[PDB]
Amino acid sequence: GSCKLPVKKATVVYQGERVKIQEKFKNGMLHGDKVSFFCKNKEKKCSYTEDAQCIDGTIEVPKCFKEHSSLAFWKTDASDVKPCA
Numbered sequence: 038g039s040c041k042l043p044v045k046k047a048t049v050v051y052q053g054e055r056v057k058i059q060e061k062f063k064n065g066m067l068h069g070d071k072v073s074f075f076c077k078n079k080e081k082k083c084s085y086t087e088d089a090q091c092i093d094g095t096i097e098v099p100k101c102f103k104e105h106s107s108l109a110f111w112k113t114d115a116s117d118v119k120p121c122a
Contacts, residue, residue, distance in 0.1 A: 038068060038093050038094030039065045039066065039067055039068065039091070039094055040065055040066040040067075040068075040070070040091040040094050040095055040096040041065050042058065042059060042062060042063075042065065042066075043089075043096050043097075043098045044058065044059075044098060044102070044104055045059065045104055046058075046059055046104060046105045047059070047074060047075075047102065047104070047105065047116075048075065048114065048116040049072040049073055049074050049075070050072060050073035050086060051070075051071075051072050055116065058072060066091040066096055067091060068091055068092065068093065068094070069090070069091065069092075070090065070091040070096075071088060071089070071090045071091075072088070072089055072090075073086035073087065073088050073089075074086065074087050074088075074089055074098065074099055074102045075087075075102075075114070075115035075116040075118075076099065076101035076102060076103075076115050077101075077103070077115045077118060078121050081121060082118065082119070083118060083119050083120055083121035083122070084115045084116065084117075084118040084119070084120055084121065085120070085121045087099035087101060087102070102115075103115070
């Protein structure tokens with residue numbers, strides 16, 4: 038079974054490449070599909086990835102994920118921050 042987009046906007050890693058999930062999966066994800074979302078470590082100010090997989094028509098987004106806000110122009114999206122070591 039197939040999953041609907043779990044979020045509105047996010048850059049994720051799909052098969053090694055960064056894509057906008059809303060663009061690359063504009064028509065849903067297929068079973069087995071796997072992406073990595075980006076989350077922030079706000080103490081070390083670096084980003085880390087958390088994988089999420091479409092399993093029987095459901096894809097659970099990691100709890101640390103935060104949706105992009107166009108209004109928050111002073112905030113850096115997790116994907117744009119230096120990666121955690």
